[PDB]
Design a protein around this ligand. Structure first.
Ligand SMILES: *CC(=O)COP(=O)(O)O
Length: 234
């Protein structure tokens, strides 16, 4: 029916108490948990986090030598293209696609973030924006590569604003992405593809979002209610 869910916590900016919480939590269904951290916080997360359903992810690396060290250190997941990378730091669609392609070639699982802004949403350009972001990514990848790729739909207006996509809006967005992948890459690939929702997810609303046809999990904050979001992936 649905492929294995993912629950990914993005530590963008009390960690030890929190890791204690994750290590002690029984997770009684099949789900890949991910804790993405910054360089400086990577070795600590890697030393303290021992729950076998969890993996550590790096963020935003773009240098092959830097990819090589991360692998060497036992980091096999990476989060790329998250909003601030695009709207503050100036990562273009192509820059993000080169980073995704590089990370796949270096042997990483990639969570690639895409999503439109407030303006784009209101002017009816969600579809063209979101499908252009991801067509940039698919231009640098082969069919086989998609087994290492995870898509996070993250509406910029829903990131940290307190505004969550309704289940309807998240579903429409995910359906549009998957229907593009089924068309352009293959129906086999689309069926296996994890599309995660990101933006204002909490214990409350996660379960309801996860009931939607095309939602395969979540990208959220590194906070204690992450446990609830993990629990929601059924
Ligand atoms: C993808 C993500 O980290 C969103 O953050 P939030 O504050 O909206 O949960």
């Amino acid at each position: 029916s649905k492929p294995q869910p993912i629950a990914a916590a993005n530590w963008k900016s009390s960690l030890s108490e929190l890791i204690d919480l994750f290590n002690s939590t029984s997770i009684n269904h099949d789900v890949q948990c991910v804790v993405a951290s910054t360089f400086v916080h990577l070795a600590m997360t890697k030393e303290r986090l021992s729950h076998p359903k969890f993996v550590i992810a790096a963020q935003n690396a773009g240098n092959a030598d830097a990819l090589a060290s991360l692998k060497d250190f036992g980091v096999n997941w990476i989060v790329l293209g998250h909003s601030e990378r695009r709207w503050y730091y100036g990562e273009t669609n192509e820059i993000v696609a080169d980073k995704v392609a590089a990370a796949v070639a270096s042997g990483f699982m990639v969570i690639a973030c895409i999503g439109e802004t407030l303006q784009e949403r209101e002017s009816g350009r969600t579809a063209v924006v979101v499908l252009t972001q991801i067509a940039a990514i698919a231009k640098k990848l082969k069919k086989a590569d998609w087994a290492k790729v995870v898509i996070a739909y993250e509406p910029v207006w829903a990131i940290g604003t307190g505004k969550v996509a309704t289940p309807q809006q998240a579903q429409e967005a995910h359906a549009l992405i998957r229907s593009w992948v089924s068309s352009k890459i293959g129906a086999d690939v689309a069926g296996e593809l994890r599309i995660l929702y990101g933006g204002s997810v909490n214990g409350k609303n996660a379960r309801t979002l996860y009931q939607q046809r095309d939602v395969n999990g979540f990208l959220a904050g590194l906070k204690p209610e992450f446990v609830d979001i993990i629990k929601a992936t059924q």
